[PDB]
Ligand SMILES: CN(C)[C@@H]1C(O)=C(C(N)=O)C(=O)[C@@]2(O)C(O)=C3C(=O)c4c(O)cccc4[C@@](C)(O)[C@H]3C[C@@H]12
Ligand SMILES: Nc1nc2c(ncn2[C@@H]2O[C@H](COP(=O)(O)OP(=O)(O)O)[C@@H](O)[C@H]2O)c(=O)[nH]1
Ligand SMILES: [Mg+2]
Ligand code: NA
């Protein structure tokens with residue numbers, strides 16, 4: 593099992609409540625960013641003015657882009673140690689160039705020069721820089737799109753045939769909302785079919801609609817139990833398409849996490865667990881990469897035997913006989 | 928009521944992510960408590 597090491601704190605600005613996550617070491621940042629163990633609507637990139645950008649500075653920006661972190665604000669730290677406006681502008685420039693190298697808008701990125709330590713000590717000059725950072729959290733990061741406002745999507749778990757009412761599929765609304773009368777496409781594994789929602793049920797009782805986060809049953813028109821299966825998803829028509837090949841960032845569990853004990857090479861054929869089911873696939877390692885050690889994280893191009901409904905940001909587990917040995921996130925659909 | 932937003936600190940080890948994390952918490956509490 594993946595070991596998740598985190599530090600959670602919450603704080604408020606007059607207009608917003610923030611759920612902040614901080615991690616100990618680089619491996620924690622990799623794991624937690626790929627698995628979605630903390631979803632960042634925005635990340636605060638801390639760069640010590642004394643060191644300037646360092647290896648994990650680059651890797652976290654790179655990971656951030658690959659896993660979908662939409663915004664990055666920079667807090668140039670330890671400025672209490674650096675009194676040289678020119679040195680500070682040098683570092684800032686280095687940071688903007690780095691952000692741009694990975695498609696973040698370096699030029700438009702807020703960069704606050706501060707000292708977390710002296711601010712923490714009660715020094716008013718520095719506390720002001722913290723307030724400035726919080727201002728950018730408020731102004732630079734837009735109100736995130738709530739689950740209910742996204743197009744409907746429900747990972748199908750079970751498939752029932754019901755006495756005279758019709759075919760029923762169950763699962764948790766991952767997002768959006770489904771109402772009786774709305775159309776729905778059944779995507780993945782087979783050719784996309786279409787149908788109509790003639791009823792949403794929850795706790796035995798008939799409802800008008802199902803909502804993100806709720807476990808419901810969806811009665812479908814005309815479709816028969818044999819035409820639908822686990823791994824497929826119900827979605828507002830035209831919002832998600834099935835794909836077989838994609839680029840992804842994956843983290844391979846370490847030995848201590850109960851993962852593999854040896855590296856795997858090209859030709860490794862594991863199962864990719866997407867939402868509800870396993871699907872075998874073939875892998876392509878990045879140029880120059882010959883093996884993947886337990887604990888490593890790499891960009892991996894995957895080709896599934898059977899299609900799956902997916903879009904950038906979709907999480908998946910890599911497994912060996914039902915046992916998890918890796919975690920990944922779709923970075924880019926290829927087709 | 929209030930909009931909820933998820934954020935976090937990324938960056939190289941020892942650059943001050945944990946210190947910044949505490950600093951944000953204490954300063955916002957003393958300013959907007
Ligand atoms: C008191 N001082 C501030 C702490 C410390 O002694 C540290 C150290 N290297 O000795 C930290 O790195 C320390 O400053 C630090 O950075 C810590 C962490 O990053 C985390 C995070 O993010 C999540 C869970 C646990 C930890 C932690 C226990 O390693 C934190 C300890 C922090
Ligand atoms: N001078 C100075 N030291 C700082 C500042 N912020 C953090 N430090 C020190 O840098 C070291 C590492 O800080 P820490 O928060 O643990 O870094 P982290 O590994 O990124 O979480 C500690 O000794 C801190 O006291 C700062 O603004 N100024
Ligand atoms: Mg830390
Ligand atoms: Na240094």
Ligand code: NA
Nearest residue numbers: 605726727730
């Ligand atoms: Na603010």
Ligand code: NA
Nearest residue numbers: 855857882883
């Ligand atoms: Na070899």
